[PDB]
Amino acid sequence: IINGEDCSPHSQPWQAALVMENELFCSGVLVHPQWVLSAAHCFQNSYTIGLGLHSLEADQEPGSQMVEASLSVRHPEYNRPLLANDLMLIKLDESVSESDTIRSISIASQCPTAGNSCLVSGWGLLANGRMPTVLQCVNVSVVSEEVCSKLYDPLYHPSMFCAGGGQDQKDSCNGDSGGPLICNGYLQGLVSFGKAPCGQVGVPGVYTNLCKFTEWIEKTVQA
């Protein structure tokens, strides 16, 4: 997260850390007690998932869990066309008993529109080029589909939307993929991709457009 700050501890209780050999490679979002959304480009043959976390380096905070997940499924149209349909569902090997610090979040029942006020969180790169230990949070605003399609020419697809791009240079970055973009209090997107470097003036980040996938998600959950 570029130009954010430490999140208030446990204020984003749906945040999931995806780690391998205790090293984070992506985040995800808890959407049901047994189900974590993430970017399809974060797919692995298995996962260790940190839930209820604030710090990655600290001792087990009260309420935190490290849970295994051995099953996941990418959207059938992922990367067709390139970068599009960037979501997958990870099924936890055990359902989590939701608690004060581990909670699911619902997906928005409305698609993004320019001006929507959002928050993105993650453990990805900071403005200073370092990786944080503590979960970071920053505010970004949705821009219009036309802005997104111009900026991300030639690869804009309706499975994507854009947020950020302000003169404030607030953005997601490497390591934030799969994490939540919460707009008006609902899960609106997952961190997906952007231009390098992150945090350029006038260049928003790109997020998976979850309002387009609610039927696929729930069909998969219920199968």
Binding site: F25, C42, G124, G175
Partner: peptide
């Protein structure tokens, strides 16, 4: 120039 924002990221020629 586009990169999928995992760490390490997945970057493309554009």
């Amino acid at each position: 120039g586009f990169c999928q924002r995992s760490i390490p990221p997945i970057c493309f020629p554009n």
